[PDB]
Amino acid sequence: SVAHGLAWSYYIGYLRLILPELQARIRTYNQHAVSQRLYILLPLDCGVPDNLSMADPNIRFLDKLPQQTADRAGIKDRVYSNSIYELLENGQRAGTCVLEYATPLQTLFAMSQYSQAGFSREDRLEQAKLFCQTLEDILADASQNNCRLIAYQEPSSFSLSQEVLRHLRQEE
Amino acid sequence: SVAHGLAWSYYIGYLRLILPELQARIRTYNQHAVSQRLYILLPLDCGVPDNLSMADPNIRFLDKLPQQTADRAGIKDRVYSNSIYELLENGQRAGTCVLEYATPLQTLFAMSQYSQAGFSREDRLEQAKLFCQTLEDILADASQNNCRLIAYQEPSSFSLSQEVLRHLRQEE
Ligand SMILES: COc1cc(CCCc2cc3sc(C(=O)CCC(=O)O)cc3cc2OC)c2cc(C(=O)CCC(=O)O)sc2c1
């Protein structure tokens, strides 16, 4: 309901707008190597920290991609900013990619805390799963070649960098 | 459902982040007069053009506000851009304000066109109304002093600039 709408809104209002322009931005950054594809982190616990290096020190901020701008609903030159991270493994750089969390999962988290939202805290997991499955279904028929969904459930020793590396290595 | 979630997501993922910083950005622009408050256009027909001057020539782009940046879900310095418009009336500048459409209304429009979205085209109006009422209910208890909702239904001679001016003049 909320998850279904969030997945559609994230796709329509964000991914549909950045993904067609992403490959050219990465090619530009590389010519001035960062992997292609936006790697989207989908923690099913809906824990969305703003600083990726805090979630895993082995996920190290490298640089920002050149920004994309577009006139969007009266916002002239609405800016789309994306960050490049290096993934470390036993002190070695193992991968470089454009990475971010899916921000609707932070909305699901925050909504469950507001009494007026009518969203119970114990419904978070079911809604996160529906969000991930819906987004997967959208991207299958859309965008798909320009991004990779990294959905995961934390157990208490978990490596976020290893989770991303497993997806990055699958691309060969 | 989709409208309820969109209203909550627009508030949590956007308005909650820009509205506390808005007054300082407008004060800065004025000291270097633009009205305070973000004026949000809510067309119940869900018609969201990207260029405001196309919707009404009497709504003239003036300048961008200084951008706001924040680290957001792994996006370092995620940029929030907002545009300042002058409102004209019989060739006279009648008001100056930060104006944009609510982008979730463009999501409602686009969702109704995608077969996979399970959203019928004839449900748009009911969903737009629910989105506007929910956002109003959120802002009443939140942010409210930093923005003004301009919800309207087009009839076939309508002045968008006059609709905004009526709200702007109410602020005195
Ligand atoms: C219009 O519907 C959406 C929905 C999302 C999913 C997250 C929740 C949310 C985030 C944003 S961010 C936002 C704006 O920046 C306004 C202008 C614009 O839509 O581009 C509007 C909304 C509305 C939202 O819920 C409806 C989204 C996420 C976006 C991002 O820019 C990702 C990074 C971030 O969340 O700040 S644009 C965007 C647009």
Side-chain angles (χ1 to χ4, degrees):
Chain A
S1 52
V2 158
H4 182 270
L6 264 45
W8 276 95
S9 311
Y10 182 55
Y11 172 66
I12 291 163
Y14 180 61
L15 297 183
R16 175 188 64 87
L17 300 158
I18 63 150
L19 296 179
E21 294 306 314
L22 187 72
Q23 249 185 54
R25 291 165 67 212
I26 291 170
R27 228 154 283 273
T28 299
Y29 184 93
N30 283 334
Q31 273 136 36
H32 289 60
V34 180
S35 288
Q36 290 300 343
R37 297 176 185 87
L38 174 62
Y39 283 78
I40 309 168
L41 297 169
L42 302 167
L44 294 170
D45 71 352
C46 301
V48 178
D50 294 321
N51 196 298
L52 257 166
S53 303
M54 293 310 294
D56 194 335
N58 285 330
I59 303 176
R60 189 179 70 196
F61 173 74
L62 176 61
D63 227 333
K64 294 166 185 183
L65 257 190
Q67 60 184 224
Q68 174 194 350
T69 61
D71 291 345
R72 180 86 189 118
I75 304 170
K76 283 243 136 209
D77 306 331
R78 194 280 208 209
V79 183
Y80 304 92
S81 314
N82 306 89
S83 297
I84 306 151
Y85 291 84
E86 289 181 321
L87 295 131
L88 313 174
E89 178 187 70
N90 305 121
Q92 289 307 309
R93 173 176 58 268
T96 305
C97 72
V98 184
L99 191 68
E100 60 199 50
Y101 283 95
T103 53
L105 292 181
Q106 183 278 136
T107 272
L108 282 188
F109 193 90
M111 239 175 121
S112 70
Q113 324 277 80
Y114 285 84
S115 47
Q116 211 199 315
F119 188 124
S120 109
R121 177 190 49 69
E122 58 178 33
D123 290 357
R124 274 201 310 255
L125 175 63
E126 182 174 69
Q127 287 297 289
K129 282 170 177 160
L130 186 57
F131 173 87
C132 298
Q133 190 58 65
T134 308
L135 187 54
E136 193 193 281
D137 298 349
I138 296 166
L139 295 170
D141 237 30
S143 282
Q144 171 105 303
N145 200 252
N146 289 116
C147 84
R148 167 66 115 168
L149 302 182
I150 305 164
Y152 54 94
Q153 247 180 293
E154 278 208 61
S156 288
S157 102
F158 175 77
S159 179
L160 187 55
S161 61
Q162 283 293 301
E163 196 69 27
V164 182
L165 280 170
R166 194 182 68 246
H167 285 89
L168 204 57
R169 287 158 168 164
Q170 233 142 53
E171 283 305 333
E172 319 110 1
Chain B
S1 52
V2 158
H4 182 270
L6 264 45
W8 276 95
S9 311
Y10 182 55
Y11 172 66
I12 291 163
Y14 180 61
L15 297 183
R16 175 188 64 87
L17 300 158
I18 63 150
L19 296 179
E21 294 306 314
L22 187 72
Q23 249 185 54
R25 291 165 67 212
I26 291 170
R27 228 154 283 273
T28 299
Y29 184 93
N30 283 334
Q31 273 136 36
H32 289 60
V34 180
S35 288
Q36 290 300 343
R37 297 176 185 87
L38 174 62
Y39 283 78
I40 309 168
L41 297 169
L42 302 167
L44 294 170
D45 71 352
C46 301
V48 178
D50 294 321
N51 196 298
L52 257 166
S53 303
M54 293 310 294
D56 194 335
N58 285 330
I59 303 176
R60 189 179 70 196
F61 173 74
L62 176 61
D63 227 333
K64 294 166 185 183
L65 257 190
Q67 60 184 224
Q68 174 194 350
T69 61
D71 291 345
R72 180 86 189 118
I75 304 170
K76 283 243 136 209
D77 306 331
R78 194 280 208 209
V79 183
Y80 304 92
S81 314
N82 306 89
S83 297
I84 306 151
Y85 291 84
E86 289 181 321
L87 295 131
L88 313 174
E89 178 187 70
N90 305 121
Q92 289 307 309
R93 173 176 58 268
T96 305
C97 72
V98 184
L99 191 68
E100 60 199 50
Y101 283 95
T103 53
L105 292 181
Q106 183 278 136
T107 272
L108 282 188
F109 193 90
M111 239 175 121
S112 70
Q113 324 277 80
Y114 285 84
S115 47
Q116 211 199 315
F119 188 124
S120 109
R121 177 190 49 69
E122 58 178 33
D123 290 357
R124 274 201 310 255
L125 175 63
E126 182 174 69
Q127 287 297 289
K129 282 170 177 160
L130 186 57
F131 173 87
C132 298
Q133 190 58 65
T134 308
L135 187 54
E136 193 193 281
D137 298 349
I138 296 166
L139 295 170
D141 237 30
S143 282
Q144 171 105 303
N145 200 252
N146 289 116
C147 84
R148 167 66 115 168
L149 302 182
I150 305 164
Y152 54 94
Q153 247 180 293
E154 278 208 61
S156 288
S157 102
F158 175 77
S159 179
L160 187 55
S161 61
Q162 283 293 301
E163 196 69 27
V164 182
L165 280 170
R166 194 182 68 246
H167 285 89
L168 204 57
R169 287 158 168 164
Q170 233 142 53
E171 283 305 333
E172 319 110 1

